[PDB]
């Protein structure tokens, strides 16, 4: 029997709240563990995500001075690297995010504004998420060009460190690449490959996602640049990934999909994409090997998945 998957964009409501309910901020080693204000603030953001339904505006939040200071620290330190280390697509859109979305060191952008901006760029939209979704549910959202996005910020005691996605990672790591048509098409292809895929292939797609969307490098003319969100939001790893230390290999999905990795240190190995169009075609070819008794395609006119039957 085939795992259930949403067939309409509104059906993303169904499992959007099936998160790991006991979140990272409850761990004794979390930077915010002993801060009860931070704990309540995290619960406040989770409640926003829990009550959100597709089609609604994403609720705006008045960020506190301490949160804006944390954002400013992350923003200013990372911004120094982007001109030289980030791919062209990143640097092309960043001044527009500063101008139209309020990307500035003294202001945390509101998700509703960012979502409207992405919709104009590529039709991608944001949906606030309370905590950790399953890979199946997170990847499935990409088939609809929906990015499940955190709204909370890391604890201010350790501005350069986060054990989890937070809004700085989403906005400075992910959002600029979702503004690019070819990247949007590539990430959507991963999402479409996931719909109804067996659990074993979801984990393979999640590994492909790790080595592309999160830690990918790409060719850029005769050079190599970072496009992975986990690199673009990590001051230390963004500098390391283009140094002589790591191993680089060409993106090759039969190898990439089974490559092991850890989440706690810098990656020892990165995969280099020829282009986002080429990576998209590779994902499409890999998806043809997933045992599914059907094929899928997104109809953006009606925002529904069309399911044929092989
Ligand atoms: Fe991420």
UniProtKB/Swiss-Prot annotation:
Changing residue 54 to Q: In PAH deficiency; severe; does not affect oligomerization. Changing residue 299 to N: In PAH deficiency. GO terms for cellular component: cytosol. Changing residue 153 to L: In PAH deficiency. Changing residue 139 to S: In PAH deficiency; severe. Changing residue 194 to Y: In PAH deficiency; mild; reduction in activity is probably due to a global conformational change in the protein that reduces allostery. Changing residue 271 to H: In PAH deficiency; severe. This is Phenylalanine-4-hydroxylase. It comes from Homo sapiens (Human). The lineage of its organism: Eukaryota, Metazoa, Chordata, Craniata, Vertebrata. The chain holds residues 117 to 426 of 452 of the full protein.
């Amino acid at each position: 029997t085939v795992p259930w998957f949403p067939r309409t964009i509104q059906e993303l409501d169904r499992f959007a709240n099936q998160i790991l309910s006991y979140g990272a901020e409850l761990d004794a080693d979390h930077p915010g563990f002993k801060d009860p204000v931070y704990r309540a603030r995290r619960k406040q953001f989770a409640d926003i995500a829990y009550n959100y339904r597709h089609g609604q505006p994403i609720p705006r939040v008045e960020y506190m001075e301490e949160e804006k200071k944390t954002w400013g620290t992350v923003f200013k330190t990372l911004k120094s690297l982007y001109k030289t280390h980030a791919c062209y697509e990143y640097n092309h859109i960043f001044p527009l995010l500063e101008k139209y979305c309020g990307f500035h060191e003294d202001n945390i952008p509101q998700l509703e504004d960012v979502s409207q901006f992405l919709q104009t760029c590529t039709g991608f939209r944001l949906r606030p998420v309370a905590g950790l979704l399953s890979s199946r549910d997170f990847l499935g959202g990409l088939a609809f060009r929906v990015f499940h996005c955190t709204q909370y910020i890391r604890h201010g005691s350790k501005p350069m460190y986060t054990p989890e996605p937070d809004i700085c990672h989403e906005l400075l790591g992910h959002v600029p690449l979702f503004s690019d048509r070819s990247f949007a098409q590539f990430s959507q292809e991963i999402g479409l490959a996931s719909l109804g895929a067996p659990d074993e292939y979801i984990e393979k797609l999640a590994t492909i996602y790790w080595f592309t969307v999160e830690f990918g490098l790409c060719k850029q003319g005769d050079s190599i640049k970072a496009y992975g969100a986990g690199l673009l939001s990590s001051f230390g790893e963004l500098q390391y990934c283009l140094s002589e230390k790591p191993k680089l290999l060409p993106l090759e999905l039969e190898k990439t999909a089974i490559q092991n990795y850890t989440v706690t240190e810098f990656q020892p190995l990165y995969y280099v994409a020829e282009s986002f169009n080429d990576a998209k075609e590779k994902v499409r070819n890999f998806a043809a090997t997933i045992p599914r008794p059907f094929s899928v395609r997104y109809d953006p006119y009606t925002q529904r998945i069309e399911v044929l039957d092989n």
